[PDB]
Amino acid sequence: SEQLQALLLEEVMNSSTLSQEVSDLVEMIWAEALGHLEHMLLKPVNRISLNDVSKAEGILLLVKAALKNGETAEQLQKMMTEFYRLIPHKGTMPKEVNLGLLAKKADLCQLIRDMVNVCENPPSLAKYRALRCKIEHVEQNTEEFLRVRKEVLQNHHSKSPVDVLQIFRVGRVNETTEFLSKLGNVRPLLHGSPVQNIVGILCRGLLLPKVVEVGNLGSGIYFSDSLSTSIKYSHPGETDGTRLLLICDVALGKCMDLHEKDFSLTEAPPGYDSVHGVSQTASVTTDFEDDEFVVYKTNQVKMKYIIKFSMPG
């Protein structure tokens, strides 16, 4: 009958042959993201609307400019109270509004924005579709797995047991075409990141940090050739309890092997396309401890793999 053929299509349409490892990975990151929000939110995230988020972000812009202007705190409070009414927090209420606070508030909003988009169509598939990216599982039997494992396990300064559990292929749609392949020195590197932020990274890609008048080579996208250095970036997850890490074909081309730090770099130095923090080596004076490759463009990156791993602890 009419309604039955419809539901027959629904079961067929919704039955997307997907690997269970991807499903569990997708379910984790979105549960992890939700977990980070509910760690410091009174109001559930589902109750929050798109309107409140747009408003929230708007209020911050005024508060940001107000601090640089040099207003009294009294005025900052009343503005921020309206912000907190749209997005309720819990615990102590930051009473001191600084550049740093606003940056974190902005990040929180952006996560909440994503959580509203995904929530609408099962919960598993909707979360996959929301990323708008092709995530595939790779078997251990395949020889691709051994390549990726080895590329990870080469530059290992620290000697902690590395448990490479799950490896997934990944690649954004609009990134691949826009990626600067023609630019020279296209080598893969490791990007350390917390599990909570992954949902956003898979959606929008690696974006440039908002400048603050944390990084020692300016506001750019940081990478490393070493894994041990990336462990300090990528903390363990809350939901599953496993570190995630993105391997990306970073086109760094000409790279300046700087010894000294430089925080004023909004973009790359003149004549070169990247900056290489030169790690502290037998007898060469560098402030940089870790190997830090940095680019200052969204289209100088192309993510390839996602490494699910865990430390002894």
Author numbering: 242 to 361, 368 to 460, 469 to 568
From the paper:
PARP4 is an ADP-ribosyltransferase that resides within the vault ribonucleoprotein organelle. PARP4 is an ADP-ribosyltransferase that uses NAD+ as a substrate to synthesize ADP-ribose modifications on molecules. The PARP1-homology region of PARP4 includes a BRCT fold, a WGR domain, and the catalytic (CAT) domain. However, PARP3 and PARP4 contain the catalytic triad H-Y-E but are considered MARylation enzymes, indicating that other structural features are important determinants of catalytic output.
